[PDB]
Ligand binder design. Structure first.
Ligand SMILES: [Zn+2]
Ligand SMILES: [Zn+2]
Ligand SMILES: [Zn+2]
Lengths: 77, 48, 255, 44, 153, 115, 65
C-alpha cells in the first residue's frame, strides 16, 4: 500500500530520462525497438511513452522510510 | 567553435563523431579532445 | 496565364541619368528591376591594393577604402572581363583584372592634392570617370605615396563600391488611385511630377478594380556606366539569372 | 636596425647594446622604419 | 650514446648501472632522459613485452634469474629483483635473451592563388597534410584553406 | 570577427545545390522549392508570375532568415497540373517578357537618340 | 577628416566638389546656391558638403616625419 501519489513528478521525469539516456549512451540494451533514432534523449522519451525503462524510483518519505515504484506503475503525464 | 560538449562514442554516432574528429579544431563544427576510458586526453590541434 | 507585354517611354535621356516609364507590367517585376539596378549591374572598381610605401597622415586602409569608391568608366570592357575567382590565373591578368599604378612624391612646401587624375591605368578603356577630379588625399612636403592596385569585375551586392547607380527614384500610382497608402489629411501633401490631379484635389477617386501600372523610373548613374547601359545590362543580368535557374531546375527534375 | 630620429628625420642604424641618440641632433626618440614585407589591401 | 639507471644514491655522486652491465660512479652534474613507458620490445621467443613484466633470463650472464622490467632500450632491458642483493636488485640483459613468464609551411607568407579568396595575402598559422590555417592579412579573421590553394611569396 | 564572407552571400559553396524540390505531404499537388543563395529579387517576381496563372491554386514564398540565403517557395496547382510545370512556365514567361522588354528598350533608346 | 568619396545614403560622387564648394563660397555664393551650382539636389548629398569638416588642413601642419 504505497501511500504516495501514483503520478510522476516533473523532477522524477527529468532524472529518469537523463539517467536512461546516459545508459543508452553507454551502449546499454534498449528495451524498446528504435526506429532509426540516434539521440539517446529521443530513445529515452520513446521508452518512457512505451513504459519500458527498467529503473525503479525510491521516494524517501520524510520519516526515514521510503516507497519503491516502477516507472510503468506511475502515471506518466 | 570554442565552447564544446562531450559526446560519448556509440555505434550510432561513431561515423559522425569520427568525421568531427577528422575535421579538428580548424573548421566548424569540430572537436578539441578525445577522452578514452583510460583518461588520456588526446588534444585535436597538435597530434595529426 | 502569361506575363504582360511591357511598353517603354523614355521621358528624359542624359549621360549622368535617365528617366523613363514602363507600362503594362506587374509591381513585382518593377521592384526586381530596381533591385537589379542597385545590386546586380556589375562594374569594375579598384579592389586589390598593394601599398609600396605610404607617408601621408592617413593610415593605409583609409587610402585603400578611398580608392575603392572611385568610379571607373567600364562601359564595354566589363562585358569581356571576367570575375577573378572564376578566371584561371596566378593572381591577376587582363582577362579578369586591370592594373593601376600611383606614385606622388611631394617635396614642395605648397600643399599637394593626390587626386583621381594621378591614377594611371595600363589600359585607356578604363579611367577614373572624372578624367574637376576626385581628391584622394592631401600631402605635405616630405610625404610620399606609392602603390599599385588592381580593379576587377563585381556588382553592388558584394560591396557598395560596385554599386553603379547613385540613387534610383521610383514611383507608381502618383494620384494614389489604388489607395495603397492612406493619407490622414490628403490636403497637406505635395503633388508628384507625374500626378495629374489639379490643384483643388488631393487624391484620385478610389478605383477598386485598379492594379499597379505606369511605373516611373529615374535611374541616376555614378558615371561608371552610362544610364542606358545600366538598364540594358540590368535586364541582361536578370535574364541570365532566370535562364541559369531554369537550367538548374531542369537538371533537378531530370535527376 | 634602421631608425628615424623623431625631430630632424635623420635615418641611422643603432646597435643592440648602445643607447639611442640622433647622429646629428642629439635627440632621444627613435621610430622604426616601415616594414619591407609585402602588404596588400582589399578596398572593401 | 649510452643511457644509465641509478642503482644507488649517495651524498655527491650517483652509482649508475648502464646498458653494458658496468656499474659506474658519476657526478650529480648526467641528464634526465624522457622515459618511454609505452615502448615495445621482443623477448627471445617473439612475444611482445612491456615494462613491469616479469621476464625470465634464459641466456646471457644472468641466465636463470627472473626479474621485473623497469626500463627499456632499442636492444637492452633493465630487470629488478628483490632477492638479488646486488645494485639494489637491478641488472641488465639484451632484449633478445629474455622470455615472458613540424610543417615547413608554418609562419610562411602565402598568397591565395585559387578559390574564392584569390588576390589576398596571409601568414600560415597552422598547417596539415590537406589544409592549413591562414591568418588573413586583409580582413580581421583567420580561415583554413587547402594547401593546393596556396602559393608562397 | 564573425562577420560572414560577403562574397559567400550569392555563391554556392561546394556540396550545395542551387534548387531542390520537396513534395509537401499536407495537401496534394503541393511542392516546396528551396533555392539557395537567392533573395527577394527572384522570389517576389516568381511569386507574382505564379499568381498570374489561374491554374495555380496557391503560390507564395518566404525567407526563413534574412542572414541566411534560403528561399522557400510553396506552389499548389490543380490536380491535373504539375507544380514543377507551373514553375517552368513561369520562368519561361518571365524570360520572354524580359527579352521583349530589352528589345523595346533598345528601340526606345534609338528613338530618343534620333529624336 | 577628408571629404568622403561618396554620399553615404545614395552614393553620388562628392569627392570632386569640396574644393569647388570652397571656391564658390569665396565667390560669396549662398551655401544653398553653391550646392545647387554643383548639381546636388537631394538633401542626402547636400548634407555631405554642408556638414563636412575638413580637418586634414589642421593635420598637415605637423612634420611629415
Ligand atoms: Zn586570370
Ligand atoms: Zn635629431
Ligand atoms: Zn547625398
Amino acid at each position: 500500500k504505497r501511500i504516495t501519489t501514483p503520478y510522476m513528478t516533473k523532477y522524477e521525469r527529468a532524472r529518469v530520462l537523463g539517467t536512461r539516456a546516459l545508459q543508452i549512451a553507454m551502449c546499454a540494451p534498449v528495451m524498446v525497438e528504435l526506429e532509426g533514432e540516434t539521440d539517446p534523449l529521443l530513445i529515452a522519451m520513446k521508452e518512457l511513452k512505451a513504459r519500458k525503462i527498467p529503473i525503479i524510483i525510491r521516494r524517501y518519505l520524510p520519516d526515514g522510510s521510503y516507497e519503491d515504484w516502477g516507472v510503468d506503475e506511475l502515471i506518466i503525464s | 567553435a570554442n565552447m564544446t560538449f562531450a559526446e560519448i562514442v556509440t555505434p550510432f554516432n561513431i561515423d559522425r563523431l569520427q568525421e568531427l574528429v577528422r575535421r579538428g579544431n580548424s573548421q566548424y563544427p569540430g572537436a578539441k579532445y578525445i577522452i578514452r576510458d583510460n583518461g588520456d586526453r588526446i588534444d585535436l590541434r597538435f597530434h595529426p | 496565364p502569361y506575363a504582360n507585354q511591357p511598353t517603354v517611354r523614355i521621358t528624359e535621356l542624359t549621360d549622368e541619368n535617365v528617366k523613363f516609364i514602363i507600362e503594362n507590367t506587374d509591381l513585382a517585376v518593377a521592384n526586381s528591376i530596381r533591385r537589379v539596378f542597385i545590386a546586380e549591374v556589375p562594374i569594375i572598381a579598384i579592389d586589390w591594393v598593394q601599398i609600396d610605401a605610404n607617408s601621408s597622415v592617413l593610415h593605409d586602409e583609409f587610402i585603400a577604402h578611398r580608392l575603392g569608391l572611385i568610379p571607373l568608366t567600364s562601359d564595354d570592357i566589363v562585358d569581356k572581363l571576367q570575375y577573378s575567382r572564376d578566371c584561371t590565373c596566378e593572381e591577376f591578368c587582363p582577362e579578369c583584372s586591370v592594373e593601376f599604378t600611383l606614385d606622388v612624391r611631394c617635396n614642395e612646401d605648397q600643399t599637394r592634392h593626390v587626386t583621381s587624375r594621378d591614377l594611371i591605368s595600363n589600359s585607356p578603356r578604363v579611367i577614373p570617370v572624372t578624367s574637376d577630379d576626385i581628391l584622394i588625399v592631401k600631402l605635405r612636403k616630405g610625404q610620399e605615396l606609392r602603390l599599385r592596385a588592381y580593379a576587377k569585375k563585381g556588382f553592388g551586392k558584394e560591396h557598395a563600391k560596385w554599386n553603379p547607380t547613385a540613387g534610383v527614384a521610383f514611383e507608381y500610382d502618383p494620384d494614389n488611385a489604388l489607395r495603397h497608402t492612406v493619407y490622414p489629411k490628403p490636403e497637406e501633401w505635395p503633388k508628384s511630377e507625374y500626378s495629374e490631379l489639379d490643384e483643388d484635389e488631393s487624391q484620385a477617386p478610389y478605383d477598386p478594380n485598379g492594379k499597379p501600372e505606369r511605373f516611373y523610373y529615374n535611374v541616376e548613374s555614378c558615371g561608371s556606366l552610362r544610364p542606358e547601359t545600366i538598364v540594358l545590362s540590368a535586364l541582361s543580368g536578370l535574364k541570365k539569372k532566370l535562364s541559369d535557374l531554369q537550367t538548374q531546375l531542369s537538371h533537378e527534375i531530370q535527376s | 636596425m634602421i631608425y628615424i630620429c623623431g625631430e630632424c628625420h635623420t635615418e641611422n642604424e643603432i646597435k643592440s647594446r648602445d643607447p639611442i641618440r640622433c647622429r646629428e641632433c642629439g635627440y632621444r626618440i627613435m621610430y622604426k622604419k616601415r616594414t619591407k614585407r609585402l602588404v596588400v589591401f582589399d578596398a572593401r | 650514446q649510452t643511457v644509465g639507471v641509478i642503482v644507488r644514491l649517495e651524498r655527491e655522486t650517483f652509482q649508475v648501472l648502464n646498458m653494458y652491465g658496468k656499474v659506474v660512479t658519476v657526478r650529480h652534474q648526467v641528464t634526465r632522459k624522457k622515459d618511454n613507458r609505452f615502448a615495445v620490445a621482443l623477448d627471445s621467443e617473439q612475444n611482445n613485452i612491456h615494462v613491469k613484466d616479469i621476464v625470465k633470463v634464459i641466456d646471457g650472464p644472468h641466465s636463470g634469474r627472473e626479474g621485473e622490467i623497469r626500463h627499456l632500450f632499442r636492444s637492452f632491458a633493465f630487470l629488478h629483483c628483490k632477492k638479488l642483493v646486488e645494485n639494489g636488485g637491478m641488472f641488465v640483459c639484451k632484449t633478445r635473451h629474455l622470455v615472458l613468464a613540424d610543417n615547413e609551411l608554418i609562419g610562411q607568407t602565402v598568397r591565395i592563388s585559387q578559390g574564392p579568396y584569390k588576390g589576398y595575402i596571409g601568414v600560415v598559422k597552422d598547417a596539415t597534410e590537406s589544409t592549413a590555417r591562414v591568418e588573413l592579412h586583409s580582413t580581421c579573421q583567420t580561415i583554413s584553406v587547402d594547401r593546393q590553394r596556396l602559393t608562397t611569396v | 570577427m564573425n562577420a560572414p564572407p560577403a562574397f559567400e552571400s550569392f555563391l554556392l559553396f561546394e556540396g550545395e545545390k542551387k534548387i531542390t524540390i520537396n513534395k509537401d505531404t499536407k495537401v496534394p499537388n503541393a511542392c516546396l522549392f528551396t533555392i539557395n543563395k537567392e533573395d527577394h529579387t527572384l522570389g517576389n517576381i516568381i511569386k507574382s508570375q505564379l499568381l498570374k496563372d489561374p491554374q495555380v491554386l496557391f503560390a507564395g514564398y518566404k525567407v526563413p532568415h534574412p542572414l541566411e540565403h534560403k528561399i522557400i517557395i510553396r506552389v499548389q496547382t490543380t490536380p491535373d497540373y504539375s507544380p514543377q510545370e507551373a514553375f517552368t512556365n513561369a520562368i519561361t514567361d518571365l524570360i520572354s517578357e524580359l527579352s521583349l522588354l530589352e528589345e523595346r528598350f533598345r528601340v526606345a533608346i534609338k528613338d530618343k537618340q534620333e529624336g | 577628416m577628408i571629404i568622403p568619396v561618396r554620399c553615404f545614403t545614395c552614393g553620388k560622387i562628392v569627392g570632386n566638389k569640396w574644393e569647388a564648394y570652397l571656391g564658390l563660397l569665396q565667390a560669396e555664393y549662398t551655401e544653398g546656391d553653391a550646392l545647387d551650382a554643383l548639381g546636388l539636389k537631394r538633401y542626402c548629398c547636400r548634407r555631405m558638403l554642408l556638414a563636412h569638416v575638413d580637418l586634414i588642413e589642421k593635420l598637415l601642419n605637423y612634420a611629415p616625419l
